[PDB]
Every structure is written in structure tokens, then in C-alpha cells.
Amino acid sequence: LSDAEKYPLRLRDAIVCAVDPERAPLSYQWLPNRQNRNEELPNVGLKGDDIHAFHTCSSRTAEYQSKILVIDPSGRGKDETGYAVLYSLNGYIYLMEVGGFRGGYDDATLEKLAKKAKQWKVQTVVHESNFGDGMFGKIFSPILLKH
Amino acid sequence: YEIFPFSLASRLSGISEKEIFGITLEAIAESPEPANSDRLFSLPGLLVSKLESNEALDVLSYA
């Protein structure tokens, strides 16, 4: 059995919590245990990957340091455009939305992305660039600004 | 993506597309700047309106 190196990434090694949009605790401590385990969330992971909350954490809370939206635009043919929403504080990175929209550079997709940039009150938009394409930023920016 | 809608401009102006490509090529021939790679790999798509099919097959076999 190759089970210890076949898959590097396990769901056991991350903290799951119902975080607050304005303040968050400043540190956490990790121990997977039957007290901390979730049992109701759907779980696609391989056998033994159990979703766990934190064990103990600080009582001191503050607002986050930085807030980013990330986009992977669709290429040739039909595929979903990917996106993600992340904040940071000290050594911790917080993940709050991931998903995708299907289409091209049509107004519906760009409208939805601009509304999503509005909804979480993000601070910077980041995207990948290749081949000297040069289109997507110039296309997207005049649509974003009204939101 | 269509930065410039050739069909709409063609219909409104009364100029065929085959002449718009000529207007572009004459301006390319007179310009003093050197061309870059993205300009060079998109010239056959404009020159292809001039060629007979028996010539375009030779261009394809060369490419």
C-alpha cells in the first residue's frame, strides 16, 4: 500500500469553522478528536478523511489584514471560469468562497464576477496572464468600475 | 473575441470587407516601424483574401 505518499493532501490537516465577516480570533490550536469532528457535511474525500473543527483558540479578535479575489478565465472551447476569495491575518490564510461560472467573455459572466467583487468588499483583483494575450484586463475593467 | 465588428461596419459604410483588408495592408506597407511577432503570425489571415485556392494550397504545404 502506497497510502502515505500516494496522495499528499488530506482533509484532516485543516481547520473548518463558521467564521465572522468582520472579526476573527488571532490564533488557533489543532487536534482532531471525536468532540471536534463534524458528521453532517458531505465528504468526497478518501476513506478516513474526517472533517474537524479547532480544539482551542484565543479569545481576542480583530479585523483581517488583506482581502483578495482570484480569477482563472476560460480558455479555448467550453470550460468553467474559476474564482476564489481569500483573506489573511498573521500566519493564517482564510478561504471563504470557491466556485465557477460557465461561458466566455459575455456580459452575464462579467456582471456576475463584478457583483461578486462587490459582495465580499474585496480590495484587489488578480488574474493569470499568458502568451501576450493582453485582452482580459482591458475587456473586464470598464465593466467592473460601475459596481 | 471580436474587437472590431467587420460585418457591422461593412453594412453601415457600404464598403465590402475585401476592401477593408486592402486599406489595412496599404497602411502596413507604408509604415516605418518594424513588425513584432504577433503582427507577423496574423498577416496570412489578411493576405488570404487575395490568393487563388491553388496558391493557398502551396502556402499551406510550405507552412
PDB file of C-alpha atoms in Angstrom:
ATOM      1  CA  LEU A   1       0.000   0.000   0.000  1.00  0.00           C
ATOM      2  CA  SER A   2       1.274   3.444  -1.028  1.00  0.00           C
ATOM      3  CA  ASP A   3      -1.203   5.291   1.223  1.00  0.00           C
ATOM      4  CA  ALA A   4       1.291   7.605   2.990  1.00  0.00           C
ATOM      5  CA  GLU A   5       2.734   9.220  -0.154  1.00  0.00           C
ATOM      6  CA  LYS A   6       0.249   8.407  -2.937  1.00  0.00           C
ATOM      7  CA  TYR A   7      -1.829  11.459  -2.027  1.00  0.00           C
ATOM      8  CA  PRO A   8      -0.006  14.426  -0.449  1.00  0.00           C
ATOM      9  CA  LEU A   9      -3.159  16.342   0.507  1.00  0.00           C
ATOM     10  CA  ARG A  10      -5.551  15.212   3.254  1.00  0.00           C
ATOM     11  CA  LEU A  11      -8.630  16.987   4.613  1.00  0.00           C
ATOM     12  CA  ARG A  12      -7.534  16.053   8.148  1.00  0.00           C
ATOM     13  CA  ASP A  13      -4.901  18.815   8.180  1.00  0.00           C
ATOM     14  CA  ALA A  14      -7.099  21.932   8.001  1.00  0.00           C
ATOM     15  CA  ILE A  15      -9.414  23.800  10.365  1.00  0.00           C
ATOM     16  CA  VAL A  16     -13.112  24.197   9.485  1.00  0.00           C
ATOM     17  CA  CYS A  17     -15.128  26.949  11.168  1.00  0.00           C
ATOM     18  CA  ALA A  18     -18.120  29.259  10.689  1.00  0.00           C
ATOM     19  CA  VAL A  19     -16.023  32.437  10.699  1.00  0.00           C
ATOM     20  CA  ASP A  20     -17.374  36.008  11.126  1.00  0.00           C
ATOM     21  CA  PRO A  21     -17.166  38.533   8.266  1.00  0.00           C
ATOM     22  CA  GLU A  22     -15.697  41.368  10.361  1.00  0.00           C
ATOM     23  CA  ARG A  23     -13.520  39.918  13.144  1.00  0.00           C
ATOM     24  CA  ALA A  24     -11.695  36.648  13.760  1.00  0.00           C
ATOM     25  CA  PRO A  25      -9.639  35.110  16.589  1.00  0.00           C
ATOM     26  CA  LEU A  26      -5.900  35.739  16.431  1.00  0.00           C
ATOM     27  CA  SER A  27      -4.653  32.145  16.921  1.00  0.00           C
ATOM     28  CA  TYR A  28      -5.782  28.518  16.893  1.00  0.00           C
ATOM     29  CA  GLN A  29      -4.655  25.063  18.025  1.00  0.00           C
ATOM     30  CA  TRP A  30      -5.178  21.795  16.150  1.00  0.00           C
ATOM     31  CA  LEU A  31      -6.161  18.353  17.477  1.00  0.00           C
ATOM     32  CA  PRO A  32      -8.537  16.020  15.573  1.00  0.00           C
ATOM     33  CA  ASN A  33     -10.891  14.399  18.074  1.00  0.00           C
ATOM     34  CA  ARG A  34     -14.397  12.912  18.333  1.00  0.00           C
ATOM     35  CA  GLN A  35     -15.504  16.038  20.200  1.00  0.00           C
ATOM     36  CA  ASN A  36     -14.321  18.231  17.318  1.00  0.00           C
ATOM     37  CA  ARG A  37     -15.341  16.028  14.378  1.00  0.00           C
ATOM     38  CA  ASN A  38     -18.124  17.020  12.009  1.00  0.00           C
ATOM     39  CA  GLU A  39     -20.587  14.379  10.811  1.00  0.00           C
ATOM     40  CA  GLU A  40     -23.236  16.173   8.712  1.00  0.00           C
ATOM     41  CA  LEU A  41     -21.266  17.919   5.952  1.00  0.00           C
ATOM     42  CA  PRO A  42     -20.922  15.968   2.683  1.00  0.00           C
ATOM     43  CA  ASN A  43     -17.462  14.464   2.326  1.00  0.00           C
ATOM     44  CA  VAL A  44     -15.942  13.413  -1.007  1.00  0.00           C
ATOM     45  CA  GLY A  45     -12.527  12.636   0.478  1.00  0.00           C
ATOM     46  CA  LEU A  46     -10.942   9.204   0.551  1.00  0.00           C
ATOM     47  CA  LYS A  47     -11.666   6.845   3.434  1.00  0.00           C
ATOM     48  CA  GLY A  48     -10.518   8.169   6.803  1.00  0.00           C
ATOM     49  CA  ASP A  49     -10.543  11.866   5.856  1.00  0.00           C
ATOM     50  CA  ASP A  50     -12.636  13.331   8.674  1.00  0.00           C
ATOM     51  CA  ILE A  51     -13.630  16.992   8.892  1.00  0.00           C
ATOM     52  CA  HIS A  52     -12.606  18.529  12.226  1.00  0.00           C
ATOM     53  CA  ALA A  53     -13.024  21.886  13.903  1.00  0.00           C
ATOM     54  CA  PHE A  54     -10.340  23.527  16.008  1.00  0.00           C
ATOM     55  CA  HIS A  55      -9.757  22.393  19.570  1.00  0.00           C
ATOM     56  CA  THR A  56      -8.881  25.641  21.413  1.00  0.00           C
ATOM     57  CA  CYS A  57      -8.330  29.230  20.303  1.00  0.00           C
ATOM     58  CA  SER A  58      -7.721  32.739  21.610  1.00  0.00           C
ATOM     59  CA  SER A  59     -10.453  34.991  22.999  1.00  0.00           C
ATOM     60  CA  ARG A  60      -9.006  38.084  21.257  1.00  0.00           C
ATOM     61  CA  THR A  61     -10.448  39.149  17.886  1.00  0.00           C
ATOM     62  CA  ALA A  62      -9.576  41.758  15.266  1.00  0.00           C
ATOM     63  CA  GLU A  63     -10.274  42.674  11.650  1.00  0.00           C
ATOM     64  CA  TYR A  64      -8.390  40.940   8.832  1.00  0.00           C
ATOM     65  CA  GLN A  65      -5.244  42.285   7.188  1.00  0.00           C
ATOM     66  CA  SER A  66      -5.850  41.785   3.441  1.00  0.00           C
ATOM     67  CA  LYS A  67      -8.610  40.590   1.096  1.00  0.00           C
ATOM     68  CA  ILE A  68      -8.117  39.111  -2.418  1.00  0.00           C
ATOM     69  CA  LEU A  69     -10.311  37.815  -5.262  1.00  0.00           C
ATOM     70  CA  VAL A  70      -8.613  35.479  -7.774  1.00  0.00           C
ATOM     71  CA  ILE A  71      -9.822  34.582 -11.298  1.00  0.00           C
ATOM     72  CA  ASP A  72      -8.792  31.899 -13.828  1.00  0.00           C
ATOM     73  CA  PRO A  73     -10.516  32.874 -17.109  1.00  0.00           C
ATOM     74  CA  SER A  74     -11.804  30.279 -19.552  1.00  0.00           C
ATOM     75  CA  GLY A  75      -9.559  29.318 -22.447  1.00  0.00           C
ATOM     76  CA  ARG A  76     -10.420  27.767 -25.793  1.00  0.00           C
ATOM     77  CA  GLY A  77     -13.612  25.782 -26.052  1.00  0.00           C
ATOM     78  CA  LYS A  78     -16.083  25.349 -23.216  1.00  0.00           C
ATOM     79  CA  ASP A  79     -14.960  25.165 -19.579  1.00  0.00           C
ATOM     80  CA  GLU A  80     -15.823  26.925 -16.339  1.00  0.00           C
ATOM     81  CA  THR A  81     -14.084  30.139 -15.295  1.00  0.00           C
ATOM     82  CA  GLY A  82     -12.625  29.591 -11.823  1.00  0.00           C
ATOM     83  CA  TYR A  83     -12.507  32.016  -8.899  1.00  0.00           C
ATOM     84  CA  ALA A  84     -11.647  32.172  -5.198  1.00  0.00           C
ATOM     85  CA  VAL A  85     -11.935  34.565  -2.224  1.00  0.00           C
ATOM     86  CA  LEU A  86      -9.212  34.694   0.449  1.00  0.00           C
ATOM     87  CA  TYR A  87      -8.186  36.892   3.370  1.00  0.00           C
ATOM     88  CA  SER A  88      -5.116  36.772   5.594  1.00  0.00           C
ATOM     89  CA  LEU A  89      -4.155  37.513   9.199  1.00  0.00           C
ATOM     90  CA  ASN A  90      -0.689  36.851  10.730  1.00  0.00           C
ATOM     91  CA  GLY A  91       0.366  33.371   9.553  1.00  0.00           C
ATOM     92  CA  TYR A  92      -3.202  32.252   8.831  1.00  0.00           C
ATOM     93  CA  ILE A  93      -4.963  32.248   5.447  1.00  0.00           C
ATOM     94  CA  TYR A  94      -8.770  32.169   5.349  1.00  0.00           C
ATOM     95  CA  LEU A  95     -10.757  30.654   2.448  1.00  0.00           C
ATOM     96  CA  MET A  96     -14.404  31.779   2.113  1.00  0.00           C
ATOM     97  CA  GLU A  97     -15.656  31.156  -1.420  1.00  0.00           C
ATOM     98  CA  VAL A  98     -14.730  28.982  -4.385  1.00  0.00           C
ATOM     99  CA  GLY A  99     -16.739  28.136  -7.475  1.00  0.00           C
ATOM    100  CA  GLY A 100     -17.116  28.673 -11.176  1.00  0.00           C
ATOM    101  CA  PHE A 101     -19.202  30.102 -14.000  1.00  0.00           C
ATOM    102  CA  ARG A 102     -19.561  28.619 -17.479  1.00  0.00           C
ATOM    103  CA  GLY A 103     -19.291  30.765 -20.591  1.00  0.00           C
ATOM    104  CA  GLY A 104     -16.907  33.071 -22.396  1.00  0.00           C
ATOM    105  CA  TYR A 105     -16.310  36.822 -22.303  1.00  0.00           C
ATOM    106  CA  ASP A 106     -20.064  37.502 -22.305  1.00  0.00           C
ATOM    107  CA  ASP A 107     -21.738  40.222 -20.255  1.00  0.00           C
ATOM    108  CA  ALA A 108     -23.523  37.794 -17.912  1.00  0.00           C
ATOM    109  CA  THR A 109     -20.313  36.182 -16.612  1.00  0.00           C
ATOM    110  CA  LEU A 110     -18.509  39.503 -16.202  1.00  0.00           C
ATOM    111  CA  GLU A 111     -21.567  41.020 -14.497  1.00  0.00           C
ATOM    112  CA  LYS A 112     -21.680  38.115 -12.030  1.00  0.00           C
ATOM    113  CA  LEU A 113     -17.955  38.450 -11.323  1.00  0.00           C
ATOM    114  CA  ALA A 114     -18.273  42.209 -10.763  1.00  0.00           C
ATOM    115  CA  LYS A 115     -21.186  41.624  -8.378  1.00  0.00           C
ATOM    116  CA  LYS A 116     -19.113  39.002  -6.546  1.00  0.00           C
ATOM    117  CA  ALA A 117     -16.287  41.537  -6.271  1.00  0.00           C
ATOM    118  CA  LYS A 118     -18.833  43.924  -4.745  1.00  0.00           C
ATOM    119  CA  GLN A 119     -20.470  41.403  -2.384  1.00  0.00           C
ATOM    120  CA  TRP A 120     -17.438  40.480  -0.250  1.00  0.00           C
ATOM    121  CA  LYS A 121     -15.967  44.037  -0.272  1.00  0.00           C
ATOM    122  CA  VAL A 122     -12.689  42.836  -1.786  1.00  0.00           C
ATOM    123  CA  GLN A 123      -9.587  45.003  -2.090  1.00  0.00           C
ATOM    124  CA  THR A 124      -7.651  43.695  -5.142  1.00  0.00           C
ATOM    125  CA  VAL A 125      -8.393  41.579  -8.240  1.00  0.00           C
ATOM    126  CA  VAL A 126      -5.681  39.220  -9.533  1.00  0.00           C
ATOM    127  CA  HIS A 127      -5.570  37.080 -12.667  1.00  0.00           C
ATOM    128  CA  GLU A 128      -3.133  34.910 -14.612  1.00  0.00           C
ATOM    129  CA  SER A 129      -1.768  36.016 -17.992  1.00  0.00           C
ATOM    130  CA  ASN A 130      -0.202  34.060 -20.859  1.00  0.00           C
ATOM    131  CA  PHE A 131       1.062  34.269 -24.452  1.00  0.00           C
ATOM    132  CA  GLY A 132       0.867  38.067 -24.647  1.00  0.00           C
ATOM    133  CA  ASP A 133      -2.919  37.796 -24.971  1.00  0.00           C
ATOM    134  CA  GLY A 134      -3.481  41.202 -23.382  1.00  0.00           C
ATOM    135  CA  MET A 135      -7.269  41.145 -23.748  1.00  0.00           C
ATOM    136  CA  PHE A 136      -8.947  40.190 -20.483  1.00  0.00           C
ATOM    137  CA  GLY A 137      -7.964  43.125 -18.270  1.00  0.00           C
ATOM    138  CA  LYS A 138      -8.848  45.704 -20.926  1.00  0.00           C
ATOM    139  CA  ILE A 139     -12.165  43.941 -21.557  1.00  0.00           C
ATOM    140  CA  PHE A 140     -13.095  43.462 -17.911  1.00  0.00           C
ATOM    141  CA  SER A 141     -12.101  46.785 -16.296  1.00  0.00           C
ATOM    142  CA  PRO A 142     -14.801  49.109 -17.808  1.00  0.00           C
ATOM    143  CA  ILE A 143     -17.492  46.651 -16.659  1.00  0.00           C
ATOM    144  CA  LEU A 144     -16.133  46.326 -13.115  1.00  0.00           C
ATOM    145  CA  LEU A 145     -15.935  50.045 -12.329  1.00  0.00           C
ATOM    146  CA  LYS A 146     -19.673  50.746 -12.116  1.00  0.00           C
ATOM    147  CA  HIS A 147     -20.028  48.217  -9.271  1.00  0.00           C
TER     148      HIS A 147
ATOM    149  CA  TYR B   1     -13.220  37.816 -29.308  1.00  0.00           C
ATOM    150  CA  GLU B   2     -14.206  40.430 -31.887  1.00  0.00           C
ATOM    151  CA  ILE B   3     -12.541  43.754 -31.093  1.00  0.00           C
ATOM    152  CA  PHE B   4     -13.816  45.355 -34.298  1.00  0.00           C
ATOM    153  CA  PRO B   5     -17.039  44.123 -35.950  1.00  0.00           C
ATOM    154  CA  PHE B   6     -16.152  43.932 -39.666  1.00  0.00           C
ATOM    155  CA  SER B   7     -19.670  42.894 -40.729  1.00  0.00           C
ATOM    156  CA  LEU B   8     -21.488  45.767 -38.999  1.00  0.00           C
ATOM    157  CA  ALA B   9     -19.050  48.398 -40.280  1.00  0.00           C
ATOM    158  CA  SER B  10     -19.252  46.822 -43.742  1.00  0.00           C
ATOM    159  CA  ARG B  11     -23.047  47.051 -43.752  1.00  0.00           C
ATOM    160  CA  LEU B  12     -23.237  50.601 -42.394  1.00  0.00           C
ATOM    161  CA  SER B  13     -20.479  52.117 -44.537  1.00  0.00           C
ATOM    162  CA  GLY B  14     -21.236  50.336 -47.793  1.00  0.00           C
ATOM    163  CA  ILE B  15     -17.662  49.019 -48.068  1.00  0.00           C
ATOM    164  CA  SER B  16     -17.013  45.325 -48.627  1.00  0.00           C
ATOM    165  CA  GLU B  17     -14.676  43.509 -46.237  1.00  0.00           C
ATOM    166  CA  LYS B  18     -12.252  42.694 -49.072  1.00  0.00           C
ATOM    167  CA  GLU B  19     -11.565  46.431 -49.402  1.00  0.00           C
ATOM    168  CA  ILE B  20     -11.153  46.990 -45.647  1.00  0.00           C
ATOM    169  CA  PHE B  21      -8.357  44.427 -45.681  1.00  0.00           C
ATOM    170  CA  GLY B  22      -6.779  46.346 -48.575  1.00  0.00           C
ATOM    171  CA  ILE B  23      -6.990  49.594 -46.592  1.00  0.00           C
ATOM    172  CA  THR B  24      -5.157  47.833 -43.757  1.00  0.00           C
ATOM    173  CA  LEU B  25      -2.476  46.275 -45.985  1.00  0.00           C
ATOM    174  CA  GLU B  26      -1.636  49.542 -47.765  1.00  0.00           C
ATOM    175  CA  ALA B  27      -1.105  51.219 -44.387  1.00  0.00           C
ATOM    176  CA  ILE B  28       1.122  48.329 -43.280  1.00  0.00           C
ATOM    177  CA  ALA B  29       3.262  48.684 -46.412  1.00  0.00           C
ATOM    178  CA  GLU B  30       3.923  52.399 -45.769  1.00  0.00           C
ATOM    179  CA  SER B  31       4.703  52.281 -42.047  1.00  0.00           C
ATOM    180  CA  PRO B  32       8.280  52.899 -40.813  1.00  0.00           C
ATOM    181  CA  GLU B  33       8.132  50.757 -37.645  1.00  0.00           C
ATOM    182  CA  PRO B  34       9.371  47.156 -37.581  1.00  0.00           C
ATOM    183  CA  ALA B  35       6.775  44.469 -37.002  1.00  0.00           C
ATOM    184  CA  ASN B  36       6.597  42.234 -33.940  1.00  0.00           C
ATOM    185  CA  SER B  37       5.846  38.515 -33.745  1.00  0.00           C
ATOM    186  CA  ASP B  38       2.122  38.814 -33.037  1.00  0.00           C
ATOM    187  CA  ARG B  39       1.739  41.027 -36.102  1.00  0.00           C
ATOM    188  CA  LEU B  40       3.779  38.613 -38.232  1.00  0.00           C
ATOM    189  CA  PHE B  41       1.807  35.499 -37.302  1.00  0.00           C
ATOM    190  CA  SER B  42      -1.530  37.239 -38.134  1.00  0.00           C
ATOM    191  CA  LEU B  43      -0.721  38.546 -41.642  1.00  0.00           C
ATOM    192  CA  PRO B  44      -1.671  35.335 -43.575  1.00  0.00           C
ATOM    193  CA  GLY B  45      -5.241  35.659 -42.290  1.00  0.00           C
ATOM    194  CA  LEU B  46      -5.455  39.021 -44.082  1.00  0.00           C
ATOM    195  CA  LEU B  47      -3.472  38.116 -47.213  1.00  0.00           C
ATOM    196  CA  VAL B  48      -5.645  35.030 -47.746  1.00  0.00           C
ATOM    197  CA  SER B  49      -8.399  37.188 -49.288  1.00  0.00           C
ATOM    198  CA  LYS B  50      -6.138  37.874 -52.304  1.00  0.00           C
ATOM    199  CA  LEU B  51      -4.994  34.352 -53.156  1.00  0.00           C
ATOM    200  CA  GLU B  52      -6.485  31.815 -55.518  1.00  0.00           C
ATOM    201  CA  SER B  53      -7.059  28.424 -53.863  1.00  0.00           C
ATOM    202  CA  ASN B  54      -4.322  26.734 -55.910  1.00  0.00           C
ATOM    203  CA  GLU B  55      -1.875  29.281 -54.439  1.00  0.00           C
ATOM    204  CA  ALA B  56      -3.193  28.938 -50.878  1.00  0.00           C
ATOM    205  CA  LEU B  57      -2.609  25.189 -51.070  1.00  0.00           C
ATOM    206  CA  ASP B  58       1.045  25.902 -51.893  1.00  0.00           C
ATOM    207  CA  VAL B  59       1.246  28.286 -48.926  1.00  0.00           C
ATOM    208  CA  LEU B  60      -0.221  25.582 -46.661  1.00  0.00           C
ATOM    209  CA  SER B  61       2.203  22.934 -47.928  1.00  0.00           C
ATOM    210  CA  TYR B  62       5.043  25.384 -47.278  1.00  0.00           C
ATOM    211  CA  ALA B  63       3.809  26.161 -43.759  1.00  0.00           C
TER     212      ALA B  63
END
